Design a protein around this ligand. Structure first.
Ligand SMILES: O=C(O)[C@@H](CO)O[C@H]1O[C@H](CO)[C@@H](O)[C@H](O)[C@@H]1O
Ligand SMILES: O=C(O)[C@@H](CO)O[C@H]1O[C@H](CO)[C@@H](O)[C@H](O)[C@@H]1O
Ligand SMILES: O=C(O)[C@@H](CO)O[C@H]1O[C@H](CO)[C@@H](O)[C@H](O)[C@@H]1O
Ligand SMILES: O=C(O)[C@@H](CO)O[C@H]1O[C@H](CO)[C@@H](O)[C@H](O)[C@@H]1O
Lengths: 445, 445, 445, 445
């Protein structure tokens, strides 16, 4: 009625109730019907949201994801729930269990990756555990003993297999790997993907989300699905993908995340007396990908650019990803002030028509902006959380506080949507998204 | 470490996480292992705790309980979960499905009842629903259309079958029906229960709670189980129980609760335009059981007494139940002040060694007091909740606030135990008790 | 910015900062410029707001007001600050120090009274004091020993000199005594006030509040000032006022407050062992005025009516005073339900255009409604507080909680205005009003 | 009662009430009786506590302090309230108005300085102002135009007159200038202060704080007062002090604060387009003093050391000043990790006997530790606040949050003491200390 919003305690309660409701036992679905399996970077956020409720169950979430890690170290972006249908492309379409030498045994997974936020969830689990006493500490530490090697293999796979030329940037072979499926970042790269004879399919995502303005188009799905055919034709062989993939881009946002994740994991390794050779490698990669992100940046504004490896051309777009250097650091002082000015000004957080002071996925003044269409404009709580946590780690305590405060105010409707209309605040996409509940739980403390 | 307690938002989150974790689908276990089925007055508290999370799921909890209501109106105190073991006495021991003409079809239940707090949960669901908008209101109101008749039948069964002589007090045939299994209230009545040839059994409750100081003794369980044999021998026939039961007491606390519940349900009936004949009956019963509670009271202190129907004697004990008149009203002004003085003084809430200003189940100065032993002394959050809600309804806003504040401070460890050691605050009994999570969720708002 | 509202801790801090800022030493001004003196019922609310900050200073506030008590027991409505100007009518206009034999020595005061909320403030001080331990309790208890007789003489003067016929209603001789200066309630009584040669004067209130729509008119002020001339002509003699005053009304809202105050004071008197003769008179008055209030009510709706003693007719208006019987109790059950329906429906709190679910001073559907004009429509936090506190005392916990929640939400801009535009929420009148800061402090706890 | 602690809203209210109560009009006293004047770094903290209440009044506090700035740029450590006595040494003892050519006109001040936390207060005022909209921003920005030059001259006088050899450390001539009057840090420098004929005097501090264990000794005060005699003999002339002062130490904690302050002011200067020459000097000073602090540190532990200029030796003590390098940065990675280990281990925050996880002024295991004796062991909320704010600025969000949480928990008794017994939590010294109320206000938000 007069105010549909919840008090902080009611909101924290409903967020926890949602997370437990999406729990299948050892994995949490990313959303009840739209995404009824475990997604890789959602799972890292889910573990962050579970850490204040049960360190034991947070550790189980990451254990389940890492039990699905490929033999070469890749963490796949989907871990399918056994017997669960209603999402396409499903395990039969991927065919990794039959085609991929490196796929895991006794887990069904996708054949592509997703951003490495996992070290950040590990840090949040350890910080919670240290406040809870000896038995909880022992649980977190036993997780580190058991999974430190797997986490190194994950980071080593990204550094060696997706940065073969030691450029300090991660190459993607599918826009889904960026986490930002239909971002304007990838449009010119996708315009050069030409599907051959693509085997028939029917979408399931728009059976659940039926408003066509909130999901990608059929044409885009045709190209997403064709990339799978190219990968399957070389049996997901790392050494053959550069020769056959019609889509090869360096993702500067993914790269900045990895730089931060490496630095975070190195600090964990020093704190918990892990092998010194591992710590040294992690710091080396943190600095390499820091330098690789800075190398992309606009000389006047500091804005970071993606790179089309096939066209050999910088990709200039006005999306939230151009703020990648703020997460990892490395810009000369003057260019970082200009970048912060871009972020806070009327092209992004300071745009006059925004309901909240939050980062829209695409600038509202760009021609590519669509207020409802997924990553082409809507405000995503997950991005708010990540920028706020990274800003606090840069020492920008008031900036991080302001993002948290506006994220909580947006989330106070209790819809736990994945993204929101930037001008009206209408929730969009699936309600009951686990990683939005998790961001709220982490923010509320 | 330095403070093991949780912030209000962390506590609300953990309470909601617990409640969803105990959800089997359409019923919530009272506790994970000790009480792995639905209990009647726990279920009413569970619905109160769910109301701020999901009015739809709160209504489902009460629907599931009422689908197990007996044909004569009795709400049984256990609704067993199909296929679930580990609690004794289980459905085979009760044998209501085969022996009891009035038992429900397609639910397994016990053969005794428990206090009628259900109307209070209905009120809390309606108050939540009215703050949430039209579709949520429609859910609550549709529950009333569907279940008003069942709620009347429940109240009518208590008024006509457990108060056959219109004394305005409820007769119990088992101490389990009071909710206070081993309370000192029932000791002299139980000393006159003599088991005949009692069929062999093994306890399950002390397999889970192994500290013998926190559960009833074998001798007590022998008498609890023998009462079942007396009931089974007359096939749970209402008309035969007065002739065969070795245990027949009027429970003044149960009676005060019923008086309040009748008044609450009458007000609901007027608000939602239910049949006027039903409303008039409810008000008639509210006043009858009010007068029946007052008739028991000590002339100097206002303390309410239970009555042994077989011995025809008043039962004088120093437990929390002697504060029954405060819940329902009816005492002359002067005797109610004396009763409040008893409650707040050094025999109860003002005892100098209590960790919290809360109501111990038995007075710490009584010879019957045992600080660990179930209802013989420990502080129960459920009683705190009930006294605080009833006090607020009497208009004693500061008294109700003080009980809430101390209940939250006791619960801030996040153990959600059913009862606590009164002097040390050590949690006792089962951890993860649903109705303690529910009281916390309701208090926190 | 995006959110001009303050957090609960920021709002409590600002309210306390305001209250200390309006403190002249032993008295607190009602507002810095518009009301730079001590007003009687404002000081009662100020003492309530001070009690969480300093029981000693809260008691000082009531000590200072009672030091200005007249010899017949009347608490005058203004205690003027020595040396302060800028308010009209000031002490020279009242001339009480010259004319009124009953006026106090070494205090300058007005010559009329205001509603008796003081006992309520005493209850709140005592409640706070009992949570703070022994030396704070001594302070509050020493105040009771010091001022019990004065409080008794205040109540006795109301019961005997302003209810000379034992009708259970308080007679007023000025609309200012109601606290609701320009209420539609008094329009037809004021229409029969015809001033003679009125000594010239210049208003000061509208030099500070310059928007003419927020204060009464010059014609209204000419009648206010003429009644002063009538009172001065009989030297404020009680026995002579009925013979000369052109304005004599029974104020049902003032009477309901008095009934409540008497009941509160009687209970205090019992708890602290005051003379029995006093407690008995206080209960007698509480009931007489409860009955006097109910005698005014409409048989169908329960709406309470004021009474014009000179015209000998019921004053039928659509203002918040209609709900007088909800504060003090006493209506038949059906009639009280009808009155709550009026309060919650579209003529008051349910009006669809209201920004908050709060009680407007005049019904938006009444022809008398003026959205900006003082007591002719605006929402006053002081009424919100008083209705909420009295509702909680009736046992209507949820109704009291809703008013408190909407009051805090309206207050959270930090203006601490005395009244707000009902549709837009715009603050009106003076900002920095002490009793609005007090209500916020008491609500926030 | 059972809980003498205050809720967060009650505590914010009481803190704000205290701060307004210590307001003399344009200055706030450090404490009502012990320190009834304006102290320099207290006023910086007071302005931080005022910023959530009134940006205008926060700016007044710094305006008043800067109006007492000496002509050479020095901010003196006391600005005396006109007409107030009860503190010794008072203005007659300092005699600055007579002797010091650089002393201000129409202000009475001391003749020594105190740490430069003022730029930090400026940042907090600006941060608050930017959340309050345009007219509040104008206030803060007009203050910057008014006082930027004065702030520059304050920093320039520190860099040029108290670091005459460009060593990047501040030289002090009195232990009072460190803010840590009786710290063990200065014990061996004070042992070489031998007073001559000292003019008689009577202490006032220990007439108010009478427990001798909470204040320095008479022998200590005789040395404090003798250094005044030395300064007065050269008429507080900067160029002459090195030739005559018996106490000359480089204060590494003061230096670390200055480095931070310079960096803060430089960033403010960039954001508000101050002269480039000024911003460049501020960054130069920030780095010089960062390097000067690191030059003092132990190679294994990172602990920072003070330096006795006269004795020409490092002062090795176990106090909170050792952690100077954590505030300003600059240590090698390994050495900073060792220093955090010292801070968190059993010699400081990890000591098993501490009631709160806070930084004691002197290590409990040091032979110099005295649990009640001022800066020789007690926990000071002002240090908690300053370490927490500086930790957040380093990016150590969780470490800053833990200090804030334990500080609020220690403060929640509402004493607002300046220091607390480290083992029992007993408040010590003066209650009603303004900068403890300020820290609480800033923490609570
Ligand atoms: O649309 C899809 O089918 C998936 C493909 O992975 O993308 C979304 O679904 C995932 C589950 O929420 C998210 O992690 C991604 O960021 C993205 O929003
Ligand atoms: O001990 C048992 O086996 C059951 C019998 O019903 O009693 C407890 O178990 C129930 C489940 O919590 C409670 O409702 C009762 O109040 C009581 O505490
Ligand atoms: O306008 C005035 O001159 C004074 C006269 O008493 O009235 C208001 O001012 C007083 C101080 O706020 C209040 O007690 C009253 O409610 C009233 O609204
Ligand atoms: O004891 C004294 O006479 C004064 C001298 O300056 O010192 C304290 O008093 C001042 C006011 O609290 C503080 O600024 C200092 O930290 C110090 O603790």
């Amino acid at each position: 009625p007069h105010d549909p919003s919840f008090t902080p305690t009611q909101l924290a309660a409903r967020a926890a109730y949602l997370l437990r409701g999406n729990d299948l036992g050892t994995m949490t679905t990313a959303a009840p019907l739209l995404y009824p399996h475990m997604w890789s970077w959602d799972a890292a956020f889910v573990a962050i949201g579970l850490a204040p409720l049960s360190v034991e169950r947070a550790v189980v979430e990451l254990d389940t994801l890492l039990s699905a890690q490929w033999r070469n170290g890749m963490i796949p972006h989907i871990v399918f729930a056994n017997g669960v249908d209603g999402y396409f492309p499903g395990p039969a379409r991927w065919a990794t269990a039959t085609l991929a030498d490196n796929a895991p045994r006794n887990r069904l997974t996708s054949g592509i990756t997703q951003p490495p936020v996992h070290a950040i969830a590990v840090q949040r689990i350890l910080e919670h555990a240290r406040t809870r006493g000896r038995s909880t500490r022992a649980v977190a530490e036993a997780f580190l003993d058991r999974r430190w090697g797997d986490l190194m293999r994950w980071h080593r796979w990204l550094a060696e297999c997706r940065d073969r030329n030691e450029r300090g940037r991660i190459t993607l072979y599918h826009g889904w790997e960026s986490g930002m499926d239909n971002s304007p970042r990838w449009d010119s790269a996708y315009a050069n993907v030409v599907p051959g004879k693509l085997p028939e399919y029917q979408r399931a995502d728009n059976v659940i989300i039926t408003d066509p303005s909130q999901r990608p188009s059929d044409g885009e799905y045709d190209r997403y699905l064709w990339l799978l055919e190219e990968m399957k034709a070389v049996r997901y062989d790392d050494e053959r993908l550069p020769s056959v993939m019609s889509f090869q881009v360096e993702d500067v946002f993914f790269s900045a995340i990895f730089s931060v994740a490496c630095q975070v994991l190195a600090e964990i390794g020093e704190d918990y007396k892990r092998p010194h050779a591992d710590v040294k490698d992690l710091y080396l990669w943190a600095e390499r990908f820091r330098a690789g992100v800075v190398e992309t940046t606009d000389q006047r504004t500091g804005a970071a650019r993606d790179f089309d490896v096939l066209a050999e051309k910088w990709l200039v777009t006005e999306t939230a990803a151009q703020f990648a250097p703020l997460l990892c650091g490395g810009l000369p002082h003057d260019r970082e002030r200009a970048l912060l000015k871009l972020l806070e000004g009327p092209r992004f957080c300071g745009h006059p028509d925004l309901k909240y002071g939050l980062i829209p996925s695409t600038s509202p003044v760009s021609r590519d902006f669509r207020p409802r269409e997924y990553w082409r404009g809507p405000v995503w709580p997950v991005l708010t959380w990540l920028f706020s946590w990274c800003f606090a780690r840069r020492g920008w305590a008031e900036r991080a506080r302001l993002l948290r405060q506006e994220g909580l105010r947006q989330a106070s409707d209790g819809s736990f949507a994945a993204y929101y209309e930037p001008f009206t605040g209408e929730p969009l996409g699936s309600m009951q998204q686990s990683w939005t509940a998790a961001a709220v739980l982490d923010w509320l403390g």
